[PDB]
Amino acid sequence: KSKLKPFFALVRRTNPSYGKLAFALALSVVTTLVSLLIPLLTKQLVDGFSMSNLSGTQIGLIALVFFVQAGLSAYATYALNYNGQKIISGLRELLWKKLIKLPVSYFDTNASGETVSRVTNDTMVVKELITTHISGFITGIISVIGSLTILFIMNWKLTLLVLVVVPLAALILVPIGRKMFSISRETQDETARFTGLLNQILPEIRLVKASNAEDVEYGRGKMGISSLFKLGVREAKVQSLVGPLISLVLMAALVAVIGYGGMQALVAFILYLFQIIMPMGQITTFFTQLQKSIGATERMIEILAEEEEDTVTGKQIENAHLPIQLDRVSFGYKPDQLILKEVSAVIEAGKVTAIVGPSGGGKTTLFKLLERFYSPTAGTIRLGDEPVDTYSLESWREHIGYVSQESPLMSGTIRENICYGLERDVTDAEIEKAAEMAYALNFIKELPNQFDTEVGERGIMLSGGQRQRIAIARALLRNPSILMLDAATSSLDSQSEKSVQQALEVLMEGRTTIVIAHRLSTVVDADQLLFVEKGEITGRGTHHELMASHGLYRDFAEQQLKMNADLEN
Amino acid sequence: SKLKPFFALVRRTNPSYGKLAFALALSVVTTLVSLLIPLLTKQLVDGFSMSNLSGTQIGLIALVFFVQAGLSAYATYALNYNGQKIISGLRELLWKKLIKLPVSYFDTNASGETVSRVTNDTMVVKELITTHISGFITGIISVIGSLTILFIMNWKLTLLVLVVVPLAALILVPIGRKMFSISRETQDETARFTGLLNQILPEIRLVKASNAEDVEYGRGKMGISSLFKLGVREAKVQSLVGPLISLVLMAALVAVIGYGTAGALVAFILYLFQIIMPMGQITTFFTQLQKSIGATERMIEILAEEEEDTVTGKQIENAHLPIQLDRVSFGYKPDQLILKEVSAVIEAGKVTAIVGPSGGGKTTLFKLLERFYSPTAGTIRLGDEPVDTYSLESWREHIGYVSQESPLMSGTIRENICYGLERDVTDAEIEKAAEMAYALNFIKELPNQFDTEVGERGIMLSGGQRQRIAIARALLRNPSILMLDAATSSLDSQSEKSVQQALEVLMEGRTTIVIAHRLSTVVDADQLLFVEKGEITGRGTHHELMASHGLYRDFAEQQLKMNADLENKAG
Numbered sequence A: 001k002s003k004l005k006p007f008f009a010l011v012r013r014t015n016p017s018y019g020k021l022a023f024a025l026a027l028s029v030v031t032t033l034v035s036l037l038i039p040l041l042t043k044q045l046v047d048g049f050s051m052s053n054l055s056g057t058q059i060g061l062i063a064l065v066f067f068v069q070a071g072l073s074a075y076a077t078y079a080l081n082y083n084g085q086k087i088i089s090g091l092r093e094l095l096w097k098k099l100i101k102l103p104v105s106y107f108d109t110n111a112s113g114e115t116v117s118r119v120t121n122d123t124m125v126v127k128e129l130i131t132t133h134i135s136g137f138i139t140g141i142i143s144v145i146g147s148l149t150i151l152f153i154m155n156w157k158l159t160l161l162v163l164v165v166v167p168l169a170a171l172i173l174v175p176i177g178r179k180m181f182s183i184s185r186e187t188q189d190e191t192a193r194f195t196g197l198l199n200q201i202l203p204e205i206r207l208v209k210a211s212n213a214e215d216v217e218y219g220r221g222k223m224g225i226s227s228l229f230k231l232g233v234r235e236a237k238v239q240s241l242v243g244p245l246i247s248l249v250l251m252a253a254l255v256a257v258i259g260y261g262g263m264q265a266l267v268a269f270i271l272y273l274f275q276i277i278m279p280m281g282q283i284t285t286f287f288t289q290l291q292k293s294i295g296a297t298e299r300m301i302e303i304l305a306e307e308e309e310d311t312v313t314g315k316q317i318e319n320a321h322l323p324i325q326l327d328r329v330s331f332g333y334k335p336d337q338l339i340l341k342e343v344s345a346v347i348e349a350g351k352v353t354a355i356v357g358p359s360g361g362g363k364t365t366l367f368k369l370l371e372r373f374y375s376p377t378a379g380t381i382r383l384g385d386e387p388v389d390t391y392s393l394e395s396w397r398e399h400i401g402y403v404s405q406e407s408p409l410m411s412g413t414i415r416e417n418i419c420y421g422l423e424r425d426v427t428d429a430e431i432e433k434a435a436e437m438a439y440a441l442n443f444i445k446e447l448p449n450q451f452d453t454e455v456g457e458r459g460i461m462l463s464g465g466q467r468q469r470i471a472i473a474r475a476l477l478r479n480p481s482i483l484m485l486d487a488a489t490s491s492l493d494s495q496s497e498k499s500v501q502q503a504l505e506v507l508m509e510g511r512t513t514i515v516i517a518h519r520l521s522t523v524v525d526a527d528q529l530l531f532v533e534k535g536e537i538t539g540r541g542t543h544h545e546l547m548a549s550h551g552l553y554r555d556f557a558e559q560q561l562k563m564n565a566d567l568e569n
Numbered sequence B: 001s002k003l004k005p006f007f008a009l010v011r012r013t014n015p016s017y018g019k020l021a022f023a024l025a026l027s028v029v030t031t032l033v034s035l036l037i038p039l040l041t042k043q044l045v046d047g048f049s050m051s052n053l054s055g056t057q058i059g060l061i062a063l064v065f066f067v068q069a070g071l072s073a074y075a076t077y078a079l080n081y082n083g084q085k086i087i088s089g090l091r092e093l094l095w096k097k098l099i100k101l102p103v104s105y106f107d108t109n110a111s112g113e114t115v116s117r118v119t120n121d122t123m124v125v126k127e128l129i130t131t132h133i134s135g136f137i138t139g140i141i142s143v144i145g146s147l148t149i150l151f152i153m154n155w156k157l158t159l160l161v162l163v164v165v166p167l168a169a170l171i172l173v174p175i176g177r178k179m180f181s182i183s184r185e186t187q188d189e190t191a192r193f194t195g196l197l198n199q200i201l202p203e204i205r206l207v208k209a210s211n212a213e214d215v216e217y218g219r220g221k222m223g224i225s226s227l228f229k230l231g232v233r234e235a236k237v238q239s240l241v242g243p244l245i246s247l248v249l250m251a252a253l254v255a256v257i258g259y260g261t262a263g264a265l266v267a268f269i270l271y272l273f274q275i276i277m278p279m280g281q282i283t284t285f286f287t288q289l290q291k292s293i294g295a296t297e298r299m300i301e302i303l304a305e306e307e308e309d310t311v312t313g314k315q316i317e318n319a320h321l322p323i324q325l326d327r328v329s330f331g332y333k334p335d336q337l338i339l340k341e342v343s344a345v346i347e348a349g350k351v352t353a354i355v356g357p358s359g360g361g362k363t364t365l366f367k368l369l370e371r372f373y374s375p376t377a378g379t380i381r382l383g384d385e386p387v388d389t390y391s392l393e394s395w396r397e398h399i400g401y402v403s404q405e406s407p408l409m410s411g412t413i414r415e416n417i418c419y420g421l422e423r424d425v426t427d428a429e430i431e432k433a434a435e436m437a438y439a440l441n442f443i444k445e446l447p448n449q450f451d452t453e454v455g456e457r458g459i460m461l462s463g464g465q466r467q468r469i470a471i472a473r474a475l476l477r478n479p480s481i482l483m484l485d486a487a488t489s490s491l492d493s494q495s496e497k498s499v500q501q502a503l504e505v506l507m508e509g510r511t512t513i514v515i516a517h518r519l520s521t522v523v524d525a526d527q528l529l530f531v532e533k534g535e536i537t538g539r540g541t542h543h544e545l546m547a548s549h550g551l552y553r554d555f556a557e558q559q560l561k562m563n564a565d566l567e568n569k570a571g
């Protein structure tokens, strides 16, 4: 029960309203004041029997009006539901905020799908128990103490004995609770993780579906998916062993009442015993259901308490034509296994520098550090007399547009994907022009409208060449100081590619552009070419210097001009 | 008529009705007790007092009978076991109709929805099926039970209640049919939006690159909370059940007191409150049945769908037939036949190719080729017998297609390659298959092959790495027809050559149809095909294009003057 304190604390912060809870707790006492006053008041029946007809015709009308108070008990149940629907939406509001602001490093260690269900399915665990959490416990403890005080006036020795029997035998309820906590956590972890599994097979059905998908993927889905939700059978098994344990704790009190009293009103003392036994069941299940919610929500607090990414610190310099620099910059996704090892290069402001290296040699990872995603292990980047964390992140993005390797698409239309950034600042005239430079506009027009044709799940309704150019157009819309293309014309045809490079050349004359290219034939006229092999920059400067670098580094034209000489002859 | 598709699916496809009988057995036993208590406990003031004369004989009247009082708890477990089986049962079912489901579905209703619409939709019925029967059966037993006792002591006013309560229970249907929609429509809303929150999270590495952290938080806040608090309207309707029941008995008070002997008058109103308690138990079950039917309404619609598997035609016993086309027209949107009337012959064993502009039907023609979609007017022949009379299930076993996108999933490098029917492969086969894709040389670098998780869509690996693994997967299956839809797009020209050289040795006497961005890659391709705006315009080796067509030259000749400048200044 030391695992109650760390989460009840978060339950408290998670509270947009409380005043409604008071109304539920007000009527709860009113109604329990009735049921404990019923056995003392309902002992006179002859009086009503005689005045059953004459008093019922003139004074008996008021008896029907009392169903309003009996109906007002239903609005108190609504208070448990309204504060339940607010506390469920409350945790939803909270966790989501610590996920969008969450650093990129988290999605390397802990999977995306895993964080989704432990946000939607985990929250719904507490809702179906918070409506009976307080409701069952409060009315339970009121009547337990209530019936006990009446018994304390009636008897002092035998009444005291129960208080040393039931709470001393309630220590056999903790192994039910402590094994209920880990039994609902493991289930709301294993299947929380397993929603995610279909979320990796189902969208990729378009590729997955061949003789591999046909049945083999049903098994991962079906065996794991079923055999792991049927772990709740073990949860329902432990829950059904509450009842006989409570029936066995009162038996220890029977020896402390009959065996102690009888040897030393006896019939009257055993009547009230069953009146405490009913709410005893109400209190006991609340304890187990509180551990059931703490178990489930144990994942929420750990995910909530995390180092978020900073937005505004020191100074927010928005307009500054700054040259990019590097000094002994080393980085790795794991301390023992590093990717970049002390790299230094100067990118001149205004002029288009480039980066070319073999696949798996550190280009994209250097650019991740560039668009400020990760922190270097030993080095830093020289910009506006600041390093990485102290300098403003919001301002850093506000004037820089980076189109990474992958073509990024989400649900909605082409308009939504481009108008992603600086929201409601862009007019119709701006998009048309931004998409024209990307060349996409020509074929955005072909299909029914720009704001009409939807992309779908990761943009499957559109071709590679179209989805790539839209991503360019998105960066073109913001008009940034530093543009970026990490193999942006990879699947894009050489004829459909030239038109793109020609438009960005006109725009970014007095503005910096750092690009990555698969074929050196594209980045022939690049101001400062950088060769990225196995994690360090080896070859610098234009093609006249690259051929003069080393023996191994000669492929700059050597491999591309080979397959070219064939067409001519 | 929406009740029937629930219980018929709950029966003939759901595993239950076993332990259910035991729960329904003890339910009658215990309700036979509570209706016999007011008739037997008439002399309980002496009944519970009779154990005084017997002495210590209490160890058989109460002590042993707590086993039967404890056996009621195992009957509650029977609801739970049949509940946990019926929930897992629907889960087993729906998943099967999703993997076997055709590609056309994920164009119209998307995945995100259909994913969460299983796992969250199934859990709606579990927390109600434990009190569904439990509350209704014990309810209806005691209602009829107390009513029959009222008949022997009263045969006039007892009949009046039966014409009051069920005639006033018609004000419970507007609660029920407005309870069906309020769970259904919300079980769309959540699923659809919670599935939409799952699209933003994996692509975060581009969310924190654009000013959109708070913009997408704003989609989440006003979106997920905005519609989850629609359950407030669901809990609102549910809390208006209680006063309606309290008001239906008031209509009976006029039909009992106002219509109705004076001694029995007090006795008739006592039993009235004994029916009123289980009345509440029956009424909430009706609303909670509509709550489950509403939720499960979209289960059945998703289950009842046309699957993707045939039986016509067996395998071919390792024989490569020639690929053909005759007036083949296709278009997702029936308004625009995107891939118009097309005819081309691909020679068996020969490495033919396809190159056209972006948006002109290459990949869409290959989707039809991999035989996913059905052509609107034409058909595909494979050795003068069409594609159809060989089933789909076997077609893919002999054909390996590596489409445009680089496909990656949660598993390691081994699980991605081994994917084409796992455990039917040995260690010697993978090593060789990965060597041909020239990824084996890069896998070795990192600690082990089998001990290297790729992650959510393989973010732990680079473009050049993830592309070659996909090629190795097809290389592992040793197929008759290989395919590369710009498989060397992000791949470096130096790291690319090694790949093309290995597949040239293997696919000598086996067909290979490829798509290329740069014509410089597919220079020596048997029969090049130009795919512009949906129809094949150019045919054969690029030399034909550079002489025949007067609008496809500058197109087939671009890659020549592009890098013709690399040997101008250097040499």
Ligand SMILES: Nc1ncnc2c1ncn2[C@@H]1O[C@H](COP(=O)(O)OP(=O)(O)OP(=O)(O)O)[C@@H](O)[C@H]1O
Pocket: A108, A333, A339, A357, A358, A359, A360, A361, A362, A363, A364, A365, A366, A405, A532, B446, B459, B460, B461, B462, B463, B464, B465, B490
């Ligand atoms: N989470 C990670 N993200 C990126 N790279 C990682 C990660 N973990 C390890 N790596 C290592 O980084 C390499 C990829 O780095 P990077 O993306 O910069 O390559 P690249 O030079 O840009 O080549 P390509 O053009 O193929 O993407 C992997 O091959 C792997 O060794």
Ligand SMILES: Nc1ncnc2c1ncn2[C@@H]1O[C@H](COP(=O)(O)OP(=O)(O)OP(=O)(O)O)[C@@H](O)[C@H]1O
Pocket: A447, A460, A461, A462, A463, A464, A465, A466, A491, A492, B107, B332, B338, B356, B357, B358, B359, B360, B361, B362, B363, B364, B365, B404
């Ligand atoms: N669901 C869909 N799937 C694929 N294509 C679609 C879909 N709906 C519409 N289309 C249209 O079909 C066109 C042809 O698709 P396809 O991928 O084959 O083009 P492509 O010529 O191969 O270009 P690229 O090589 O750049 O991908 C797309 O450009 C798109 O406009």
Ligand SMILES: [Mg+2]
Pocket: A363, A364, A365, A405, B462, B463
């Ligand atoms: Mg990269």
Ligand SMILES: [Mg+2]
Pocket: A463, A464, A465, B362, B363, B404
């Ligand atoms: Mg394509």
